[PDB]
């Protein structure tokens, strides 16, 4: 009964790994977007741009 | 007469053996359903399941 009981534990573990995989797949996009936002704020910090490039 | 009386005793013992056999034949099914019920309770305990899987 214990040996047959372990299959649900294995299923829950694979389900948790799949959920973490989806989380990392979203985190890749979130990280590249944060990097592009840092690049935009860094370029915008400069005072040599005119108003149009700032907007 | 005492020797002849024992045939009824053997009949009662065989009757009890048959009744216990029927009880064990039902207990096989009862234990199997109990094991599957334990597996369902294990799967239901997980917090990562959606409402339809729990239902």
Curated annotation (Swiss-Prot), chains A, B:
Transmembrane segments: none annotated. It comes from the Bacteria. GO terms for molecular function: structural molecule activity. Keywords: Bacterial flagellum, Secreted. Signal peptide: none annotated. One of its GO terms (cellular component) is bacterial-type flagellum. Coiled coil: none annotated. It is found in: Secreted; Bacterial flagellum. In C.crescentus, the flagellar filament is composed of multiple flagellins of 29 kDa; 27 kDa and 25 kDa. Belongs to the bacterial flagellin family. Flagellin is the subunit protein which polymerizes to form the filaments of bacterial flagella. This is Flagellin FljL. It comes from Caulobacter vibrioides (strain ATCC 19089 / CIP 103742 / CB 15) (Caulobacter crescentus). The chain holds residues 56 to 110 of 273 of the full protein.
